[PDB]
Amino acid sequence: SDGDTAMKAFNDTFWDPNAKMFWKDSKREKHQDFWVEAELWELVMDAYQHTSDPALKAELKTQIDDVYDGTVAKYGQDWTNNPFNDDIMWWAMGSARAYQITGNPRYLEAARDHFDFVYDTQWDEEFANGGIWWLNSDHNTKNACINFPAAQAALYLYDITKDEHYLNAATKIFRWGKTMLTDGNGKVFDRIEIEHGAVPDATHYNQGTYIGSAVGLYKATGNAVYLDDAVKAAKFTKNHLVDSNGVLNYEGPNGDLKGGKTILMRNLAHLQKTLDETGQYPEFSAEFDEWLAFNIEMAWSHQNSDHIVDGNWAGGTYESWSSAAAVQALNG
Numbered sequence: 001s002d003g004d005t006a007m008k009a010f011n012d013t014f015w016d017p018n019a020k021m022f023w024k025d026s027k028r029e030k031h032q033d034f035w036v037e038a039e040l041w042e043l044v045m046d047a048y049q050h051t052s053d054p055a056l057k058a059e060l061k062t063q064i065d066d067v068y069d070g071t072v073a074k075y076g077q078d079w080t081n082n083p084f085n086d087d088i089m090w091w092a093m094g095s096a097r098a099y100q101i102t103g104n105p106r107y108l109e110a111a112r113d114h115f116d117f118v119y120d121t122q123w124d125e126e127f128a129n130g131g132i133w134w135l136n137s138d139h140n141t142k143n144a145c146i147n148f149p150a151a152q153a154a155l156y157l158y159d160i161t162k163d164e165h166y167l168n169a170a171t172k173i174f175r176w177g178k179t180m181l182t183d184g185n186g187k188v189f190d191r192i193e194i195e196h197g198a199v200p201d202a203t204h205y206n207q208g209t210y211i212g213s214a215v216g217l218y219k220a221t222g223n224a225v226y227l228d229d230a231v232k233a234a235k236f237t238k239n240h241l242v243d244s245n246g247v248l249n250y251e252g253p254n255g256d257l258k259g260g261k262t263i264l265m266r267n268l269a270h271l272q273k274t275l276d277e278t279g280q281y282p283e284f285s286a287e288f289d290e291w292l293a294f295n296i297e298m299a300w301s302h303q304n305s306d307h308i309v310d311g312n313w314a315g316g317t318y319e320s321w322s323s324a325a326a327v328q329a330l331n332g
Ligand SMILES: OC[C@H]1O[C@H](OC[C@H]2NC[C@@H](O)[C@@H](O)[C@@H]2O)[C@@H](O)[C@@H](O)[C@@H]1O
Pocket: 143, 144, 145, 190, 191, 199, 201, 202, 203, 254, 256, 257
């Protein structure tokens, strides 16, 4: 019941049933940022897929539709007016998953149309020899936070439609990103800036979408190198994006990064499942599972009286993005 309890508490604290959006924090003065709301959307989907309580499962299934409706009410159905390609892609990926769960074709259309806008018009072969631009306004940087999510979205679209166009896209985007946005040993770089070069700053959410795309490509292609890529980036996370006791870092003060453990945990769950299914990397798998279980217990040892867990897992206004990671962790 821990995943159920966590999700119910998160909803009670942060869901606004009127606006059909999550509040940014418990002061209930402002709703969550657009791109972060796609990640909270996916959290609802993950709880839906995790729960064995059929009553809660039905409520969460309805909430999947409600989140979309609330966002569309405030932001439109056509997100291509947003200058951030990442914002667009986070919602395209979410929409693909919503289609898988609900079978409502509005979600497939949303996913496909927005994926196609970004991939078809924002890929460039010249600067850095490939990659998708961060923005559709100015073209100055190519970033992990658009490129790996784009590969993931393409993989969901391939799973749904089997259009070889999408498998080819995932393969090409990931190949470029491994080459230009990693060190080849699992450290994922933030971005590559024109007139400067790479910015080798690593964070949980970019480790996470690299790992998820790698695991997806391993499954789609049967090429073990992709699983090796995922394992290296999981090892880098476990050893180098943790505190002196092995607890995943708190990545404040940047608001976007504070909740990044949410996206990391989502994708580490995919790696765990693949390792469990295949029996590959058994020694790593054992250490990895113990370290995850440790992190989750530490997080939840710090829940407050309302069963809300602040994003400082190692340690009075609770924020929905920072608090989501602990919920995600119990809904893998
Ligand atoms: O340490 C990683 C980066 O963290 C901060 O940027 C967060 C986020 N901002 C938008 C876009 O630049 C993303 O690629 C990025 O992850 C910021 O301090 C960066 O300088 C830093 O590299």
